[PDB]
Amino acid sequence: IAWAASAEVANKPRLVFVGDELRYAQGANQRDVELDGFVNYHWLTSPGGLGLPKVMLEAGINAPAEVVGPDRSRRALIAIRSSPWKAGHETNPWHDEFDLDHGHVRYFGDHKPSTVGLPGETKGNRLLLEAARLHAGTTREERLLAPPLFLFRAVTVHRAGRAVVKGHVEFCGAAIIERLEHVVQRDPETGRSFPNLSLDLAVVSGGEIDGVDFRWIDDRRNAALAAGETLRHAPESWIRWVRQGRLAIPGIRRRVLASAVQSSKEQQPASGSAEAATLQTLYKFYDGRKHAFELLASRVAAEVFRESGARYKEGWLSRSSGDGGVDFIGRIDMGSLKASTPVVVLGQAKCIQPTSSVSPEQVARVVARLRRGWIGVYVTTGSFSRQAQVEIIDDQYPVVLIAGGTLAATVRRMVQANYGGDLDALLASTVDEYGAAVTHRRPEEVISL
Amino acid sequence: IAWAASAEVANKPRLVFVGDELRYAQGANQRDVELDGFVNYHWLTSPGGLGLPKVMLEAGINAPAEVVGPDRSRRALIAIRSSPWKAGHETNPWHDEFDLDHGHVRYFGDHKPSTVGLPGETKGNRLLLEAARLHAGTTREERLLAPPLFLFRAVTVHRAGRAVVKGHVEFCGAAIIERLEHVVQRDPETGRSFPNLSLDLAVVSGGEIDGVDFRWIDDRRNAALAAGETLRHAPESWIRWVRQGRLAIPGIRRRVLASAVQSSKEQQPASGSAEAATLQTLYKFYDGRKHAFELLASRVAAEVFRESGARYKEGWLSRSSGDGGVDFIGRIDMGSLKASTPVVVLGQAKCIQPTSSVSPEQVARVVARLRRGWIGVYVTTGSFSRQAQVEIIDDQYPVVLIAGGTLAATVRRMVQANYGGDLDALLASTVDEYGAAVTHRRPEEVISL
Amino acid sequence: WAASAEVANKPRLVFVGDELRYAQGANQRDVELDGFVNYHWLTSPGGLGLPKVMLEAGINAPAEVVGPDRSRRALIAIRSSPWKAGHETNPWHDEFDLDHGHVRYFGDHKPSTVGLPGETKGNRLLLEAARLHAGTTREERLLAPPLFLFRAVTVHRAGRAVVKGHVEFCGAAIIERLEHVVQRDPETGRSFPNLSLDLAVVSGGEIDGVDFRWIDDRRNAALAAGETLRHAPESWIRWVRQGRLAIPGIRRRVLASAVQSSKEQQPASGSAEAATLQTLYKFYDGRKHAFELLASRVAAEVFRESGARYKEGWLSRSSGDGGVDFIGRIDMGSLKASTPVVVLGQAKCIQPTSSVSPEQVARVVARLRRGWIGVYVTTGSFSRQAQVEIIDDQYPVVLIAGGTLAATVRRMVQANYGGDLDALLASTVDEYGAAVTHRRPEEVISL
Amino acid sequence: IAWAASAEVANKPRLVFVGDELRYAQGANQRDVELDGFVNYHWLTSPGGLGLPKVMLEAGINAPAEVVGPDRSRRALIAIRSSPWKAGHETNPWHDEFDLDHGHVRYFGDHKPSTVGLPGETKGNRLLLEAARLHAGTTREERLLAPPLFLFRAVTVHRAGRAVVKGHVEFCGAAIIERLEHVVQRDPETGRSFPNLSLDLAVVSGGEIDGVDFRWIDDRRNAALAAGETLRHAPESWIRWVRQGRLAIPGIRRRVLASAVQSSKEQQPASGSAEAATLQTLYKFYDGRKHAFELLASRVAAEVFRESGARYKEGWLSRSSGDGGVDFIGRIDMGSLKASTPVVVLGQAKCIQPTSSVSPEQVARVVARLRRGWIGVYVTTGSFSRQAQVEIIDDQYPVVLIAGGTLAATVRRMVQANYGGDLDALLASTVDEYGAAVTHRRPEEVISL
DNA sequence: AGCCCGGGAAATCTCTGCTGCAGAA
DNA sequence: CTTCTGCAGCAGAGATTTCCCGGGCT
């Protein structure tokens, strides 16, 4: 009669997104989807339809009893707990830390000075040892025998009008063991150093959703399922890792960007549009004269900074000759009347073919010029490479990107704002006023201006 | 008609400012004031009234004829000229260092690799020694006979029209020799080492007027009048350098900030006003409460960037207790949407009576937390110390200053615009709704939000 | 050969920081003495029959051992200073950092000894061992005798005084850097040349300490030098084949908080460095400028202690305090073209019982551009908040409290004006504005 | 009748200058002032009217007979002849190095392989130990009697349309030993090893002039002379060292002002260098695999920082898969033992041909990620472009440039002293390890280990 | 006689200015 | 048939490069 419940639980979906807050309490029920206004942990792990003991989440790491598949016995999984009691991290080198953005995690063993035996005597560290031996071997079946590592970090909600600490967890994703190294920590109370296992783990990609649902955690606990039969509900990252090996880790590692990135198509105007044709006329006109293109880049950048609702003044153009990383410069004032701060804005302009794209080093050449409190801006006829936007966003470089469609729209504004001599004599206005004064002056001299 | 042209030119306001455009041309009359839109150099030095030969600015280190008074024959003055090769400065040997704000100018002797022997056979070095012995003299009489050093640097600018490369120079002011020492320089062209003379100079100040009377040279090249009557048109800084010794140099040093210094009374609201009483009630209310003040400052700083119409996003509170280097966080998107780049704003507040000023050390603690493209903001009911302000301006700290006046004005504006009721409603709303941090994350994560 | 196989049957390991019972009395057979492990039993096992190697103050080692291929030198044993109990007051002493696996030791050379440094048998074998560890072949490196460090201990045992005839295991180390210094002993009272040795403590890998079987196996004559390493630490084994290239990465790392309490930053009361600190406090209480110059020289000595290249730029100003008190520069590179590192510094003389606020050092931190480092010198200690703010927010600034300052000053004085502190103090107060210039920190590059 | 000549010597200044070409002959006389147009060495060292014995000078360390001053027996001077003896064919890695631009010189002892016992068993080494003993020293009295070391280097000169390398010598100035270390040297051609002492020293400055007054030399070389009255014509720098001690060592360093920009030819090894072919093989070998060259460059930079005797630790590699922004990471501990601070080094390595330079964009891509107090290092076979280095100097980029001769130098010196001549095992090691040292840790995580 | 971190004009020098021709997408 | 895109020791101001002067001294 229990087979019906097992099947019922087996078929129904149980989804959880990475970074979500899960409810963790003593006792309670595993048959409840929601508890105290939050998603139940035990229900997500072991719904109870299988009639199996719950998966406990306690100090250090925790692993269920050995699950005997028809083929052979297998370790179900490993639930890992990290305790930042009240955002204690990271004042000290014990330093259990998660970077869920780039998909890297560093955790440490539960070994303590009170323990007499060598590291690995504790249940947790020994399970970490077995997992380490299983994550590194010759055969390809032992990796199927290797239990997955589920990351959980303590979190205080301060929600629903009631501030509470503990009793809540956070799923940081599934992890694989990249490294295991014996390190020596220090107990301040007794002033005594102790050996312990240090684990470097990598979080894999969760797919398009970035959140995973686990019907396969029951598969790992299923007594009637073979080791290679449990990968049915597994994410594509993990199974493709099983296929390829540890060489696929950089490709399967989870990647979260703070801001969205734009494809080449979206930045540019439509192909059949006359805006793109106008952009190509800009390409033809400013190919010979890069200096005009620079002056226009200054005008456009100005229009953008003023479109943001911020105060901007264009200082000048760095050089008309001698190349270098700076083409021109302006100033952004941050704040309101009688309350502001000066910001030096280094304007850069590069004219290139639409097919080719700007390389990250060319942008980083402008980024390197930037001192503290400065903002760069890059204006190009084409688009930006993926690695460029990656280096800008992930490393948090403050650069304003001006693509083809943006400058095209800006031009569309300016040409009807001032239509003297039609569209073309604005470009002529770029060449005629291209001299636009000059300066050997450092960027810091723009403040006094 | 000896004194006919002299007596009228003897009382003229020959005050000159640093940064103006001066004309140095061959075949320039001493009678005409301005040449082709700008003032003439030869006219400025000796405008025909004296009958003296026009001082020619040549050969780097330059000086007029020796002057013999009744006693102690002296050198009238010294005309120092630093010129771009071009690209002699900052791209070549020589490249005399120039720092205007700190009044420090490093200059090189007239010794050349083509000139053999110890520095120096050229008149430049000998004049440099003859002057330096008087400038470094511990005797006031020596400081009386000490030849003034008038510095000049050719700058390209003009008004409208076209840029200038020759015939145009800029008055850099007068300077006093800080140090004199020998150096070794190497020529890239020949690869041969040669000795030279190097010296550190201290540029003086003209005061609030910041003007330098060029009538000084008249009594400086007068053989009849000596020392006592030669300082009549000299700047007070120079006469103070004459009366006292080299120990008063840092006190008489020229220090000009790019921005403007705000007085304590200037930062505070007008005396007797309603906003003043409002601020007094603010300090009265928030003297005991800190977190509520921090939140209030977060709200004030929230729309102070948004007042211009600029794109802003209000962040979170770091911690309920234990504080942080900066109390609250904000974000500033720059440019059109999807082209917007995040700018991290780190704010901190402190409650103190308007009669008190903010120490530079804590502001430094704020700006020490800054990174690439990060800006700070400090909010207080009091004013800021002058040292703090000048340290921020001179070293270009990127931070917004919120004094008691701006705070009171912005707060009253907030109350009337969004409430209009008694401030008590706002205060209470703040204390109940926040002052308690729901989210405690790293500041770099504000970009993801 | 039953006994040797018997002691080969049972493992022998000792962790770093293990207290050992040191007694000329007692025997080789027994495993423990007076509640502590026996040293002579540790170094000399009962299943061998070899004599007991004695551990005396300073460097000590058994004579060379004849091998089938070539003669092999027995390991090096080092005994630490009393630190101090009134026995040694010398500024140049043994500095132990077991957290980063870095240990600086100073050899034994005395004014009574006439000649050149390294003439004594211990120092002869020491320099020869230095030759072996700096060997160009793998054979020469495996021929190199291990260096085992030991320290004296001042503690408490079972509610009683401690300790009489007890030491502490500091681990095994590899000869990395050598130096030639000239020190001066006040009680000697003549000055004498002395050797300096920078050692890198190895990591035991999976184990904290090392296997004691290694030494007992290497001491044996039949053991071949290539095959004499079996239980040797993986770090040492890797180093033998890799050479000097392995040294930077194989050092033992102990994860611990870098925050030192106010008491830890202050020298011992009986150290006699503290008295110097107090004299400096009363002296520079009125004159801060001489303290700024003194701090510049002290920092200059600190950076040159690691063998780096420091060049003193100048002092910022002689009138009033500010963000920076003094400026220096550290050049590192191909030397055909050297990459300069700007050094900004501030010094404040306060009471040793007073703590330095984080804002005051943040005033210096805020002046740091990319590739620049800060220096803060104070007679007192640093506050906890300051330390944790510097560590957590990753501030590139060295901190000099009362202890480090007094120690460095003592070193400098003894090095030059040894016998007279007033001469060094005179050297600090004579020139005020001689080193003082008004320049931008980025102008130190030209110098 | 040698008294009058001595008085003659004392009255007229006798000066030598740095960079001067001197004629040295073993069979010359002390009488003739100059030989073949060039001033004589012996005549300058000691005149014929002095009565002083003929001083001998040969390859390596040369020390004249000891002298007894009335106060105490004293060592006058130490002459040092340094010649590569290469004729451009040097393979000796421990050959002496000279950098007079920064005033640092690496000298090496006269210890020989066949020379037995512990170093030094030779004259030069021992008297250099005495010299160093006096150099470090203690109290002023020892500093007074401390014998100066004068450097003479074999140079190629040109005389009357004819040029011969041997027969002349150059004056490199008087220097003081900073530090002395123990090192093991090996003959490149034939495999061997011998102990020797290595000295890092620095040349002082000549004060007003660039060189040394040899009249003071005569004053010190005098048998009967006072203690502090021995030097009246001595350079002020040496007197400053005398009064201060080691405290003035960083301040008295000889400095020559020149452009730090190096050309392609200047960075790369000589035309007859055997390391060139090795570099070609390195290009052909790492042409397919770049990350192996990245690890190679990591260990190279490590050896470079370890060459100064500083504190450095091995880092890790970012990816070893495809391409990426940062090639390798490292850490440097700056300060003493008890007191130090960690700094993060971001290293980049791209394999190009020695004839090709490095564009500024590529290195600026590395500079862009450098935080506050962070440095970087670029290691490559090819040289660096002029614009790149200029860009480094202008913006004060903290980067170490390893290219051409330097790379081959540290690599060869490494092979000779570590892997013992076999480069095959080294290359193979770089091949096997490109996937072993790869961690996904943050650059800030290097502080942990 | 001389020099010198010069300016002036008259000597080349730099690099996009483009028009009608033709011939091609 | 279009309508643009090639061909051409072409035009030509602003910017360098040469060379002639300069002014005021020891």
Coordinates of N, CA, C and O in Angstrom, one line a residue, chain D residues 196-243:
Chain D
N196 N 80.1 30.3 -2.7 CA 80.7 31.7 -2.9 C 79.8 32.7 -2.3 O 78.6 32.5 -2.1
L197 N 80.3 33.9 -1.9 CA 79.6 34.9 -1.3 C 79.1 36.0 -2.3 O 79.9 36.3 -3.2
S198 N 77.9 36.4 -2.1 CA 77.3 37.4 -3.0 C 77.0 38.7 -2.3 O 76.4 38.7 -1.2
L199 N 77.4 39.8 -2.8 CA 77.2 41.1 -2.1 C 76.3 42.1 -2.9 O 76.5 42.3 -4.1
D200 N 75.4 42.6 -2.1 CA 74.5 43.7 -2.7 C 75.0 45.0 -2.0 O 74.9 45.2 -0.8
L201 N 75.5 45.9 -2.9 CA 76.1 47.1 -2.4 C 75.6 48.3 -3.2 O 74.9 48.2 -4.2
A202 N 75.9 49.5 -2.7 CA 75.4 50.8 -3.3 C 76.4 51.8 -3.4 O 77.2 52.1 -2.4
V203 N 76.5 52.5 -4.5 CA 77.5 53.6 -4.7 C 76.9 54.9 -4.2 O 75.8 55.3 -4.4
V204 N 77.8 55.7 -3.4 CA 77.4 57.0 -2.9 C 77.4 58.0 -4.0 O 77.6 57.8 -5.1
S205 N 77.1 59.3 -3.5 CA 77.1 60.4 -4.4 C 78.3 61.3 -4.2 O 78.7 61.4 -3.0
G206 N 78.7 62.0 -5.2 CA 79.9 62.9 -5.1 C 79.6 64.3 -4.6 O 80.5 65.2 -4.8
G207 N 78.4 64.5 -4.1 CA 78.0 65.8 -3.7 C 77.8 66.8 -4.8 O 77.0 66.6 -5.7
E208 N 78.6 67.9 -4.8 CA 78.5 68.9 -5.8 C 78.9 68.3 -7.2 O 78.2 68.6 -8.2
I209 N 79.9 67.5 -7.2 CA 80.4 66.9 -8.4 C 79.9 65.4 -8.5 O 79.3 64.9 -7.6
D210 N 80.2 64.8 -9.7 CA 79.9 63.4 -9.8 C 81.2 62.6 -9.9 O 81.8 62.5 -11.0
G211 N 81.7 62.1 -8.8 CA 83.0 61.4 -8.8 C 83.6 61.5 -7.4 O 82.9 61.7 -6.4
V212 N 84.9 61.4 -7.3 CA 85.6 61.5 -6.0 C 86.9 62.3 -6.0 O 87.6 62.3 -7.0
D213 N 87.1 63.1 -4.9 CA 88.3 63.9 -4.8 C 89.4 63.0 -4.3 O 89.3 62.4 -3.2
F214 N 90.4 62.8 -5.1 CA 91.5 61.9 -4.8 C 92.6 62.6 -3.9 O 93.5 61.9 -3.4
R215 N 92.4 63.9 -3.6 CA 93.2 64.5 -2.6 C 92.8 64.0 -1.2 O 93.7 63.8 -0.4
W216 N 91.6 63.8 -1.0 CA 91.1 63.2 0.2 C 91.6 61.7 0.3 O 91.9 61.3 1.4
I217 N 91.7 61.1 -0.8 CA 92.3 59.7 -0.8 C 93.8 59.8 -0.3 O 94.2 59.0 0.5
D218 N 94.5 60.8 -0.8 CA 95.9 61.0 -0.3 C 95.9 61.3 1.2 O 96.8 60.9 1.9
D219 N 94.9 62.0 1.7 CA 94.8 62.4 3.1 C 94.5 61.1 3.9 O 95.0 61.0 5.0
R220 N 93.7 60.2 3.4 CA 93.4 59.0 4.1 C 94.5 58.0 4.0 O 94.8 57.2 5.0
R221 N 95.2 58.0 2.9 CA 96.3 57.0 2.6 C 97.5 57.4 3.4 O 98.5 56.7 3.5
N222 N 97.5 58.6 4.1 CA 98.6 59.1 4.9 C 98.8 58.2 6.1 O 97.9 57.8 6.7
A223 N 100.1 57.9 6.4 CA 100.4 57.1 7.6 C 100.1 57.8 8.9 O 99.4 57.3 9.7
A224 N 100.6 59.0 9.0 CA 100.4 59.8 10.3 C 99.3 60.9 10.1 O 99.5 61.9 9.5
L225 N 98.1 60.6 10.5 CA 96.9 61.5 10.4 C 96.0 61.4 11.5 O 96.0 60.4 12.3
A226 N 95.1 62.4 11.7 CA 94.1 62.4 12.8 C 92.9 61.5 12.5 O 92.9 60.8 11.5
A227 N 91.9 61.5 13.3 CA 90.8 60.7 13.2 C 89.7 61.3 12.3 O 89.5 60.8 11.2
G228 N 89.1 62.4 12.7 CA 88.1 63.0 11.9 C 88.6 64.2 11.0 O 87.9 64.7 10.2
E229 N 89.9 64.5 11.2 CA 90.5 65.5 10.5 C 91.1 65.0 9.2 O 91.8 65.7 8.4
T230 N 91.0 63.7 9.0 CA 91.5 63.0 7.8 C 90.8 63.5 6.5 O 91.4 63.5 5.4
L231 N 89.6 64.0 6.6 CA 88.8 64.3 5.4 C 88.3 65.7 5.5 O 87.5 66.1 6.4
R232 N 88.7 66.6 4.6 CA 88.3 68.0 4.5 C 87.7 68.2 3.1 O 86.9 69.1 2.8
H233 N 88.3 67.5 2.1 CA 87.9 67.5 0.7 C 86.9 66.4 0.4 O 86.5 66.3 -0.8
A234 N 86.7 65.5 1.3 CA 85.8 64.3 1.1 C 84.4 64.8 0.7 O 83.9 65.8 1.1
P235 N 83.7 63.9 -0.1 CA 82.3 64.2 -0.5 C 81.4 64.3 0.7 O 81.6 63.5 1.7
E236 N 80.5 65.2 0.8 CA 79.6 65.4 1.9 C 78.7 64.1 2.2 O 78.3 63.9 3.4
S237 N 78.5 63.3 1.2 CA 77.6 62.1 1.4 C 78.3 61.1 2.3 O 77.7 60.5 3.2
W238 N 79.6 60.9 2.1 CA 80.4 60.0 2.9 C 80.5 60.4 4.4 O 80.5 59.6 5.3
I239 N 80.6 61.7 4.6 CA 80.6 62.3 5.9 C 79.2 62.1 6.6 O 79.1 61.9 7.8
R240 N 78.2 62.3 5.8 CA 76.8 62.1 6.2 C 76.6 60.6 6.7 O 76.0 60.3 7.7
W241 N 77.2 59.7 5.9 CA 77.2 58.3 6.3 C 78.0 58.1 7.6 O 77.6 57.2 8.4
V242 N 79.1 58.8 7.7 CA 79.9 58.7 8.9 C 79.2 59.1 10.1 O 79.3 58.4 11.2
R243 N 78.5 60.2 10.1 CA 77.7 60.7 11.2 C 76.5 59.9 11.5 O 76.2 59.6 12.7

